[PDB]
Amino acid sequence: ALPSIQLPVDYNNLFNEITDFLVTFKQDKGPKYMAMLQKVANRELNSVIIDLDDILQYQNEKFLQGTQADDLVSAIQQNANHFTELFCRAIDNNMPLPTKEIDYKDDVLDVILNQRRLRNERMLSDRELFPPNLTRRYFLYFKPLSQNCARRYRKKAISSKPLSVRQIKGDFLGQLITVRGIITRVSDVKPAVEVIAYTCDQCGYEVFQEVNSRTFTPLSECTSEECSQNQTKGQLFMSTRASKFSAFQECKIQELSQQVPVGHIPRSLNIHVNGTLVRSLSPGDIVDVTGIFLPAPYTGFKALKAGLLTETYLEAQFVRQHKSDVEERVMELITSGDVYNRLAKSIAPEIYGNLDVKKALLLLLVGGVDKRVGIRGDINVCLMGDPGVAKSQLLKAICKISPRGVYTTGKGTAAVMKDPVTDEMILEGGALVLADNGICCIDEFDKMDESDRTAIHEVMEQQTISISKAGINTTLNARTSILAAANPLYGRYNPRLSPLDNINLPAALLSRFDILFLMLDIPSRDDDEKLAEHVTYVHMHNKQPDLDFTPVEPSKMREYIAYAKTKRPVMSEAVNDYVVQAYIRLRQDSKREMKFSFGQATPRTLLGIIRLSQALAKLRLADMVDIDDVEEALRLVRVSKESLYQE
Amino acid sequence: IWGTNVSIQECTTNFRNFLMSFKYKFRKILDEREEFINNTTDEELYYIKQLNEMRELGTSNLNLDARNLLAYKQTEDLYHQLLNYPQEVISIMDQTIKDCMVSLIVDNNLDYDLDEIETKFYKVRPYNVGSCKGMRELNPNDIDKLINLKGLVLRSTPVIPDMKVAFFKCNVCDHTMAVEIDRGVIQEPARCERIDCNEPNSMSLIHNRCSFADKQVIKLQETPDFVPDGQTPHSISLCVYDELVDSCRAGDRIEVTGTFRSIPIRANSRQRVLKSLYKTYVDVVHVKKVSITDQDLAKIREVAAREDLYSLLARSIAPSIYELEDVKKGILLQLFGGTNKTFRYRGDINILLCGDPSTSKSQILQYVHKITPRGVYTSGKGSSAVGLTAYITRDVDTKQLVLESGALVLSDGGVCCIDEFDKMSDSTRSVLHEVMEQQTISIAKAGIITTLNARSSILASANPIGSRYNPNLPVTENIDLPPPLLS
DNA sequence: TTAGAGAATTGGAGAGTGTGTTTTTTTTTTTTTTT
DNA sequence: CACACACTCTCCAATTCTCTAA
Ligand SMILES: Nc1ncnc2c1ncn2[C@@H]1O[C@H](COP(=O)(O)OP(=O)(O)OP(O)(O)=S)[C@@H](O)[C@H]1O
Ligand SMILES: [Mg+2]
Ligand SMILES: [Zn+2]
Ligand SMILES: [Zn+2]
């Protein structure tokens, strides 16, 4: 038998209080929630976000005038699933009639309403039928309590404290909690059925079946009164037209590396977003998901197979992300600060020296626009450098400021197919596709195998990576700007040896790079002293030794690229002339020098010069490409070439 | 129509009066087209002409457009119901098409077999139903609603036979009758239809004597130019019935119109327990590939009679590449090739493009690949797109020993433009030796011994060793290619 | 021969005995022949 | 383990039948 227990909650009084709250609450138009229900009746909104701050304010207001409440906020944070049904029932009771001419072109549910009502009425006079969830066209959610900063939050308001996946103990099941973590795997949207709309071949009667079990059994038996009394034994046919579906997405939230105790492994927690919250979560997110932590049961046969050990999921209710005024601000900064010399030092404030490398990194960050083909607007630079030089620090600084920027190493791109056996997903990405409209910081570029060599070669002159797993020949758009940080083999760079001999990169791949910098360290007497002072100051004060203008926000570069991308600075005819004689004399001096053959100016150097000039004008208003721009571009190109011949 | 409060009779009458007396001028004025002056192409009865074309060609499907329903006046509710109730609407449209065609045959006195027309099933293919809906924006209120989709097909399953008409046999009196199958349920007879036998439970299904239809599930993939740059493109499963089968091979890009439908899936095969996730597909009703002439003979004679034909063709081979006069000449001659003399003689031109690394060494390769009818562009060093040689693969799905042909074969008559010919492996270099010498590729692996006819044309382009080609040094010392392969 | 009182049999629901699942070959070592 | 399926064991009232009915 089932015993009985005494619990002081009194659901009926709570329901009366709930109805009073939905009727008699007006935030400091009429009532807020009545206005929301009016909008719902107009079919202009299908999300009743029941805030808990509002319920707390309602309780506080009625505390001074009768205390006509039973701590609802503390009564639904303990059991939220039942109160979702209570709120839905209270909304159906107080649902206002529409106050708008809503088109009813697709009124299948209304058609079923009136049809079944007429069929019942023609015999009711003898001359609930509809499930409560079937009629609802809204989804109800809970917004957790905000910060209290008062004695009310005396360790209470468990939905106020963002927990981690490890701290979600088993005794929180059924409560309305919130977790903080990084999404890792969000599934595709699937229509989860809430109530089926079986129709019988005879007897005319359709019987509905509410289901929340992840698995059900079709009725297929006309148990209707007419069918049973006539013993027709009719079978039932599903009608997806008259059924009710809710979009279902099954996310999965991990925990941040700062929440994991030492020696442990990050945990994970399944999230079941459904309703209007679908597609609000993506794998590259850090969120504070608020939901009801519920024990999904192993209903079926593995049920008896396992036992009391349940599996849990978080029925998400509210997702809070963490991650022309700006145009005026950046315009004013342009007027005040010299972008050319300021943004360069802003990229790597904690990295001393190598200013021209930073200037080239600005051009890569902006990049010219030459989408028209006959070509490409992606700037690629490689820093051959030297062991012990802060190439990796520069790469990380670029990654942390460049939108859609990723950092990766040669030895641990490409792509993998169908990683999980169960779901059997198709065409999982890699590292180059993630930085589609961004930059890939390929550290240890020399130590990167032939497969990735071919992959990056395809990406570099195709902007689209492809696979040939099972003859599908599918491709992934990866228009990523490439930033390489290869380092010389046999340790330190040898200036005497030829540059391509020092690093195991084929001349075919290196020659396609728009600009190349060889930036090696030399033991000096003053540069090292300033470097040591800088690093030690950073260690003391945890902040850079600020000695000049150091802008921080990257939105200025975003504004510049978005501004001049539509502008597309058109090159001048005199510019084209000066660059054709520039190529002529460059090739002439390349011959007369031939010392290292890693120079012969090539059509690709002209394309790189054009795109660098385009990027420079793209930074400075529109159509600024003139002699002034091309002189700086050619100066940068010549300096980069000379860098290969340093000392 | 159930659940709609819509009479089928009024819809049939609307579509009937829309069939004839309708002109393309209504469509021309619907979209506010300025060039509505045309008379023959606008004021003529477009659908009557289409029906006459079907009569004189004996076709079934109709490439009906959706906007033509908006152009006419009484078929606006019909268009909205088509978007909302595609199944019943399409069925009544097909019945109306058949009845209108037989009525036209009766009226115009164009003598024809009425039974032959009645037997043939006539279909309608409403395309351009609406805006190009996104795959990622398929919320579950679009169930049983007409949907337009764009994408590139990944693969296509073979023909899947689905039973349409059952066929039972009385195992005691050899009485056979056919039971129509509706919604995939077997309504087997309770007893023998013949009264002299009327034996219950004496019916056994004769599988091979039934009637089957064609179903071809197609795995559509979201087009790259519309997917968000972050996540990988999603996929949906098509369904193609009774026609349009093999009308879109893998790799094609199509604009598909169909009803977005969802069905339950059995959690356990033995039991009737159904998962509550309702896997979704779409029932295709029309596919459009978004992607020889006497006048042509006259054009051939005109271009052939030109004195400068040779130079003109040389220029047209690589219009965007300057100089390279003789290279284009050689490539042009390769495109034609010698006579295929038989009685083996190759009768083909093999061209290698050496020198220092050249962008044209690639640009002209893509140009000639686009020019040549057959053949395929392939990289010798990478061979990622095509393996460049025929080798046996286990296709994983069914784990079967499928033999997939390389790049050399499948390019008979065509030109197999190789790239990075210097960096290709030695194993495939031996295959190149075999194909250029023997003209066939022979395989002996996993119990399969066979010879594949290649008969291909080689147009390779190999970069040299070092920074650039050295003219003083011989070609062998610069290209890194065995002398027998170069000769 | 007709409208109506008597025997005689057996199919359609249900008591019950025994079934049938969930259930898995990834990833990681170790060997071996070619490369 | 237990819920659902397939099926042997088992059982009365509506359906058929032939002696006595009108
Ligand atoms: N110019 C610089 N300014 C500040 N710190 C620097 C500078 N150069 C080097 N460092 C320091 O050097 C370390 C990072 O150097 P790395 O970039 O790892 O050298 P590396 O050349 O990448 O070494 P590898 O692994 O052989 S490529 C950090 O401790 C930095 O603080
Ligand atoms: Mg490093
Ligand atoms: Zn029934
Ligand atoms: Zn029979």
A215 inside 8 A of chain B by CB: yes
**Nearest to residue A315, comparing CAs of A423, A176, A186?**
A176
What are residue B301's phi and psi, to 5 degrees? -65, -40
State in Å: Cα B163 to ligand 4 middle: 23
Distance CA A178, CA A159 (A): 5
Angle between helices A555-567 and A339-347 (to 10 degrees): 130
How many other CB atoms sit within 10 Å of the CB of residue B88? 17
Q: Which residues does chain A have within 8 Å of residue B252's beta carbon, measured at their own beta carbons?
A: none
Q: How many angstroms separate the CA atoms of A193 and A127, rounded? A: 38
Q: How far, in Å, CA of A138 to CA of B385, rounded?
A: 50
The nearest CA of chain B is from the CA of A442 a distance in Å of 19
Residue of chain B nearest A107, judged by CA positions: B4
Q: What is the DSSP letter of B74?
A: T
Burial class (CB in 10 A: 0-12, 13-18, 19+), A592: exposed
Chain A interface includes B275 (CB < 8 A): yes
Q: Backbone phi, then psi, for B135, in 5-degree steps?
A: -65, -40
**Residue B288's CB: how many other CB atoms inside 10 A?**
16
Give backbone dihedrals phi and psi of A605, rounded to 5 degrees, phi first: -65, -40
Whether residue B43 lies within 8 A of chain A, CB to CB, comes out as: no
Q: How many residues does chain B have?
A: 487
Distances, alpha carbon A413 to alpha carbons A433, A435, A450, B59, B188, in Å: 8, 11, 12, 52, 58
State whether the beta carbon of B267 lies below 7 angstroms from any atom of strand D: no
Nucleotide nearest to B271 (CA to C1'): D4
A299 CA: nearest nucleotide by C1' = D3
List B211's β-bridge partners, or say none. Answer: B165
B49 is in an annotated binding site: no
A302 touches strand D (CB under 7 A): no
Task: Name A111's bridge partners.
Answer: none
Is A215 within 7 A of strand D by CB distance? no
Q: Strand C: which positions are within 7 A of a protein CB?
A: 13, 20-27, 35
Tell me whether residues B232 and A428 touch, CB distance under 8 A: yes
Q: How far is the CA of B200 from the C1' of C11 (A)?
A: 13
Ligand 1 closest atom vs CA A387: 21
A231 touches strand C (CB under 7 A): yes
Closest chain B residue by Cα to residue A219: B272
In total, chain A counts a number of residues equal to 647
Q: Which of A216, A428, A454 sits opposite B384 (nearest CB)?
A: A454
| Yes or no, beta carbons of B224 and A604 under 8 Å apart | no
The DSSP letter of residue A426 is -
Distance CA A186, CA A428 (A): 12
Strand D bases, protein C-beta under 7 A: 1-5
Comparing CB atoms, the residue among B231, B278, B466 nearest residue A193 is: B278
Q: Are A181 and A269 in contact (CB under 8 A)?
A: yes
Edge-to-edge strand ranges of the sheet holding B203-205: B176-177, B168-170, B203-205
Residues of B in contact with A470 (CB under 8 A): 155, 395-397
List, in order, residues 6 or more apart from B245 with CB less than 8 Å away: B159, B214, B216
Is ligand 1 within 6 A of the CB of residue A358? no
Q: Cβ B277–A472 below 8 Å, yes or no?
A: no
How many whole angstroms separate alpha carbon B324 and alpha carbon B461? 14
Q: Do B141 and A507 touch (CB under 8 A)?
A: no
For strand B401-404 and strand B415-419, is the pairing parallel, antiparallel, or unpaired?
Answer: unpaired
3-state secondary structure of B128: coil
Return the beta strands (E) in A412-560 as ranges: 439-443, 464-466, 475-477, 481-485, 515-517
- Ligand 2 centroid distance, CA of A522 (Å): 17
Q: Do A282 and B224 touch (CB under 8 A)?
A: no
Phi, psi of A269 (to 5 degrees): -150, 120
Is the Cα torsion angle B244, B246, B247, B252 positive or negative in sign? positive
Token code pair at residue B77: 């509710």
A217 touches strand D (CB under 7 A): yes
* Helix H or strand E segment including A182: strand A176-182
Contact check, Cβ <8 Å, A105/B396 = no
- Whether B398 and chain A come into contact, CB under 8 Å, resolves to no
The structure tokens 């007006």 sit at A26
- Considering all nucleic acid strands, name the nucleotide whose C1' atom is nearest to the C-alpha of residue A305: C22
Identity of the residue in A111, A190, A598 whose CB atom sits nearest the CB atom of B278: A190
Provide the experimental method for this PDB entry: cryo-EM
Nucleotide nearest to A304 (CA to C1'): D1
∠ CA A252-B143-A246, rounded to 5° = 40
Cβ contact, residue pair A240, B274, below 8 Å: no
Residue A17 and residue A61: Cα distance in Å, rounded? 13
**What values do phi and psi take at A23, rounded to 5?**
-90, -45
A290 lines ligand 1 (CB under 6 A): no
Range list of β-strands (E), A332-471? 381-383, 406-409, 439-443, 464-466
Determine which residue's CA is closest to atom 9 belonging to ligand 1.
Answer: A390
Closest partner residue to A436 among B229, B357, B384, by Cβ? B229
Structure tokens at B102: 């037989």
Cα of A404 vs centre of ligand 1, distance in Å, is: 24
Q: Which atom of ligand 1 is nearest to the CA of A390?
A: 17
Residue A121 Cα distances to A114, A116, A226, A244, A552, angstroms: 10, 8, 15, 24, 72
Q: Helices A80-93 and A11-23 sit at what angle, rounded to 10 degrees?
A: 50
Using the mean position of ligand 4's atoms as its centre, give its distance from the Cα of residue B205 in Å. 14
Give CA–CA dist A519/A386, Å, rounded.
7
Residues ending a continuous segment of chain A before a break (C–N > 2.5 Å):
28, 127, 323, 374, 412, 594
User: Tokens 């879109």 correspond to what residue?
Assistant: B248
Mark A253-281 as b/e (b = at least 16 C-beta within 10 Å).
bbbeeebbeeeeebbebebbbbbbbbebb
* B117: enclosing H helix or E strand: helix B114-119
- The single residue listed with the structure tokens 């009743």 is A48
| Cβ pair B262:A240 closer than 8 A | yes
A484 CA → ligand 2 middle, Å: 11
Is B229–A404 a contact, with Cβ atoms under 8 angstroms apart?
A: yes
Q: Is the CB of A373 under 7 A from strand C?
A: no
How would you write A529-556 as a 3-class SS string? HHHHHHHHHHHHHCCCCCCCCCCCCCHH
Closest CA relative to residue A320, chosen from A178, A148, A188:
A178
| Distance between CA atoms of residues B213 and A67, nearest Å | 71
Beta-carbon contacts of B11 under 8 Å, excluding residues fewer than 6 positions away, are: B78, B81, B89, B92
Q: Kindly identify which residue of chain B lies nearest to residue A213, measuring between CA atoms.
A: B276
CB-CB neighbors (< 8 A) of B3 in chain A: 108, 111-112, 115, 239, 241-242
Maximum distance among all Cα pairs of chain B, rounded to whole angstroms: 102
Instruction: Report B:215-244 residues touching A (Cβ under 8 A).
Output: 221, 224-225, 227, 229-235
**Does any strand C atom come closer than 7 Å to the Cβ of A301?**
yes
Task: Please tell me the distance from the alpha carbon of residue A319 to that of residue B389, in angstroms, as a whole number.
Answer: 53
H or E segment at A511?
helix A507-511
Q: Which fold has domain A324-640?
A: Rossmann fold (3.40.50)
The DSSP bridge partners found for residue A493 are none
